[PDB]
Amino acid sequence: GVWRNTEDEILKAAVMKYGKNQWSRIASLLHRKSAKQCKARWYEWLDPSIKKTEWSREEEEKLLHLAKLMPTQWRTIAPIIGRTAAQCLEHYEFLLDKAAQ
Amino acid sequence: RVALEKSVSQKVAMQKDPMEPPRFKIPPSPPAPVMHSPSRKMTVKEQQEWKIPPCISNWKNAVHINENFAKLAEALYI
Amino acid sequence: AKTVTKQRVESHFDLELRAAVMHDILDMMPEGIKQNKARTILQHLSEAWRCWKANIPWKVPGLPTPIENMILRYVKAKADWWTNTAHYNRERIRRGATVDKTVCKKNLGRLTRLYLKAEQERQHNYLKDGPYITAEEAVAVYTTTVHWLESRRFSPIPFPPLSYKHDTKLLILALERLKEAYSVKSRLNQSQREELGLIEQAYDNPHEALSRIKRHLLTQRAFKEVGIEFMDLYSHLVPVYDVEPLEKITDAYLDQYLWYEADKRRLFPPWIKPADTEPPPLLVYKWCQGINNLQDVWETSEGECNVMLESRFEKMYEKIDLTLLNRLLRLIVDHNIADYMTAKNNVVINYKDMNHTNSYGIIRGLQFASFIVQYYGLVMDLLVLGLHRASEMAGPPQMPNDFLSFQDIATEAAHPIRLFCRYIDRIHIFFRFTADEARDLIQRYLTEHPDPNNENIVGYNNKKCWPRDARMRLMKHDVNLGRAVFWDIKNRLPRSVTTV
């Protein structure tokens, strides 16, 4: 179900060896993880191109503008800002709370 | 024509009795000289121009947004 | 020598394409080349073809341009051979000529890849080439829906409180649908065993499940990817969507709740079918009764005409705009629920090695998709009718009409449209024109589309199932009246939202 520490380590190494089109081979290494869960974990969180840094001022401005533009469409928005859609979503909610004060 | 017709007629068509079946179980021409223009050796520049990168396979191992969206979204807020 | 038979067809194609590419490599490479590197060029050919099938852009940075031009040439040749074979094996499958099941599996596979290449292009063009619904057409659609809901005195649906008295009944219904999908099968997938596990866990403690659903509806706005497959019905293919189980329980609960509150609050007027009260053959029976009981319906002594056109709203699911869909759902439900529904349509779709974001149409395999279609179809009905004729058809909101009936006889005769029905995508309209109204329409139609050679009989299509006495007689007046009625209805509907 949830992702342990050691499971993430196995998943990173296995993607580094087998690439990104063989999730059935990668699922065989883990315990009780299916191929779809492995893929989802990689793109959501474990991929190195995911940027886990603080938000710049520019990146926030684009967030607020695009969220006005296409409301609730975070998969469309998210590659324009270059964050994960979940990241974009929670940071939007952060700024909305902050503007409420 | 006559010779090849004879050949094809033969192809399609001690005393030996008709009943017996067949009995036995079932270098080229000398090399012609290579008559060639003298070869031109390859330059290092153009030899670099035929360098082929290795194949890195995704399978084997071994966004621009039109401005009218703004207009549409703006209209709906109004 | 052995012939090329059906076993050997594909392998022989690869065998010959391989040899021809090899010949051009030899004639292309300069004299006295240090290395041949032929096997690597053929590896790049394979990778190019595999990237074509996955719709993944192929670039190799170092590669010389004679070699790249040759590779793009031969990949395009193989693509044409592949796609033409897909084209005529589908025709054979539909006509019944094939009986082999592996060729049906191969064609289904080829067809899926071609569909996703096209659909991925459609999404890209939607983002680049702008929304197709103009600001004017969108504001007119929105404002019309507001006036409709305002005149019917509709009270909008609230968010379900956690102390809502009906929520375990709605949960029990939702779980029975979800469990019924798995009723008979043995040794299911891992995801299906996961889904049965979640259903049994929600049977055990419903309050936990209900708390999770309410928290999802309040806060979740970025979802997991759905898989797509096709059900081959031999004459066409039907998309089948695979949604994650957690999300699916939340959607099924929302689906039950929305239909219950919309039925209680009278959102959908009675022309919207399928209704719960009648099976479809009773609907057919009702229509005949409805037609027979219009006033003076079969009299033609003065030159009146009846017209009955059955058509479909073409591509209505695909042309839904999710921005305008959000603004139109907000008129009917708590904005939190509207955000959840609209955001839920925005997912990555993935079959095999290919995946793309859906950003334009709806995903029809969601649990609440039926609601969206009916509600969005309601807006299209208000375009085809007027607000005025639709108010006459639905009746005053204190005493509403039932299906195909009117408050008065004068009310039914006041307008040419007498009967209207919208069974999902399909529509059936019954018109009664006098001779003046018919002459008016035919003159407007013949102004726009002048026909000197009288070829209108050629396109017109009628029922070849009946005998010749029973088919439509294609008389000049009647062929032009039918085309004029259809043209007028077609002018009602903006091409960006749907068409006939």
Next chain:
Amino acid sequence: EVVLHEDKKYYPTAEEVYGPEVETIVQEEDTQPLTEPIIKPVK
């Protein structure tokens, strides 16, 4: 503007790329049945 997805054209026209002095023929269908021979014998 605005052109719908089924309306849009990706490539230029044939007489745009070849010019006015070139005649372009597109033959999607043929003008004879198979029943009618190409070399018909005299009867």
Next chain:
Amino acid sequence: GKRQHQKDKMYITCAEYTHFYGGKKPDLPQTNFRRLPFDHCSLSLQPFVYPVCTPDGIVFDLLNIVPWLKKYGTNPSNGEKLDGRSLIKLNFSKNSEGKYHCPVLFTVFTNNTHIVAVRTTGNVYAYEAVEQLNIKAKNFRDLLTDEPFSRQDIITLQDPTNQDPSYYLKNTNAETRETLQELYKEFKGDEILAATMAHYSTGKVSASFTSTAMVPETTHEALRYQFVKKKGYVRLHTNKGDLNLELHCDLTPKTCENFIRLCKKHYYDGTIFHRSIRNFVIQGGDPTGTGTGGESYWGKPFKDEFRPNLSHTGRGILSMANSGPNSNRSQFFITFRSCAYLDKKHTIFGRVVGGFDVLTAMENVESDPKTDRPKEEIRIDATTVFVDPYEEADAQIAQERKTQLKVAP
């Protein structure tokens, strides 16, 4: 052979190609019977009340044509325009029952009958009566009245043998007008959305061909080179005196460029010779002093440049240290004697040409036998490139570029 699968064959069959893929369809009937009944106006397609005919022969109702002529000068049947005066009134006789008949022959008019009108008088007869009476009996009087008509006048009515944005937007309500007005008064161009919107090539054609999410590209869209000039000369100002080096820049251009470039930016200032061996080459060029440090101008390790006419023969040969093939870095050494073993293992890029006494003084410094590190520091204080071939080449290149622009503005 057995013709076992004849519908599903390895190719498209003949019948299948005819029926679906562009074979010739028989196409038998075309508009076989499409005639309006005689009693109907041609414009309205409904039964006329006041018949009028055009000289050509088209018959249709007055009440429909007259507004039509006012709106459009022309007649519906033809492109040509028609002046309303030319319309000739038609009068159709009735039976006792009320049907249209020929006045003289009494035959009831049908969609199959042949119907003829006389222009001057306007009456309408079956063609039989007109023929049998007037064409045979050579009188041209009308049958009902004695009015005489010419043959031009006879006409056949029936012979069976033959933009804005608020376009698209009727009925705009108050909220729509007000919204579109505020929208145009307020809306301004978007900024973020607008921003969003060699032997080898850029890969725009291959990528656009292989993925349909990229816009169709049909036409292909396709580094700097530095060459050593003359002789490179560098003085190493060491704490043991000055060593002059000749660099073989024409032969080893990358290695010479690295060296001179490194020297010009003071890279070797203060660096030591960290490795010195009796009857072996002295080595330095490591700004870390550790024996394993240093870095090239490019960033990583660059290629060897072995040459058949450069060997480690004689004293004072200048070569690169490395960690294996094509990994030169910064480190370099000077030989104390011939050493053929070094050939094709270390790039030779120059030789000592002055300060041989200094090289000897360097050699004579004792080194720690365990580490080969000199016991008293041997140090490069400064490096002077007194002939820099690479610098001259760069200046020439800039001039050439300017000339090209002038030729093709």
Next chain:
Amino acid sequence: TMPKPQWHPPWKLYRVISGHLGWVRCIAVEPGNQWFVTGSADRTIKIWDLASGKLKLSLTGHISTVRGVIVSTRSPYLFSCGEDKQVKCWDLEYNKVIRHYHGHLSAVYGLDLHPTIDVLVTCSRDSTARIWDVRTKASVHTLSGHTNAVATVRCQAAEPQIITGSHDTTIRLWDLVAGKTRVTLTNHKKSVRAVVLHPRHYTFASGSPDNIKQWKFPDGSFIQNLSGHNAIINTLTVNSDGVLVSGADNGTMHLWDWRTGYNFQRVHAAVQPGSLDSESGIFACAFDQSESRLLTAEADKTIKVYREDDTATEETHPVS
């Protein structure tokens, strides 16, 4: 250096015909100039009208790419070969395949008919050529000796009766009755893909990516080297007036003067609307029997027709 070459007017494109769905690989004109026949990677054989450029008919028997077509002069037959190892005889009175030939091991690459005797000669990727009786469908001979795929084959009445060029870059001149090689010509460095026989000059030219070479019958004596077309050339066609056409694999035609080896025109044609610039290429060309028009079968799936330009004079276009 050479005499002054004869003046030939330029040719211009005047008609583009587009109906196939794969590469047009071969083209041939009927003896009476009424129609021509093209074979395709589409696997269809199409019969077009030569005057109007209209599609008369399509024939669909083949299993893979149709690689060569030829029309019989002495009987109402059409012969086609393909990459599906199969050679068919089509009866144009019935529009039906009436007979077929078997024994080839791989893809058949081209075929030709002997102009007096009724034999068919086909060349193939198993590095053989075969001589077939037209009637009784029997290999009378298999010409063997090339070490890689035989790419082209030509026939004449005079000796030698069969010329085969190959992917092992050699030309071979064969005895038809014995089935042996007489002469082997090894002057090319890359593979010989096209050979053309002069109508009345008793010479022949062969093409390779190197350069075109021009040779003399019966012994194969080398005459001349025609150089300048630096591309893989797929077809050579010679006119009766002495025009030579070389169509390349990258889509360029070079017109040449046969007499002197003078290259007087270079033509590069645009591709059709849908295609890539890499899709341009010429797989076949043929003059009609009138020799007024030139037909090229191409890799952007079009047939292009060239016409000789009548307004141009020696003064307008000089011979350099």
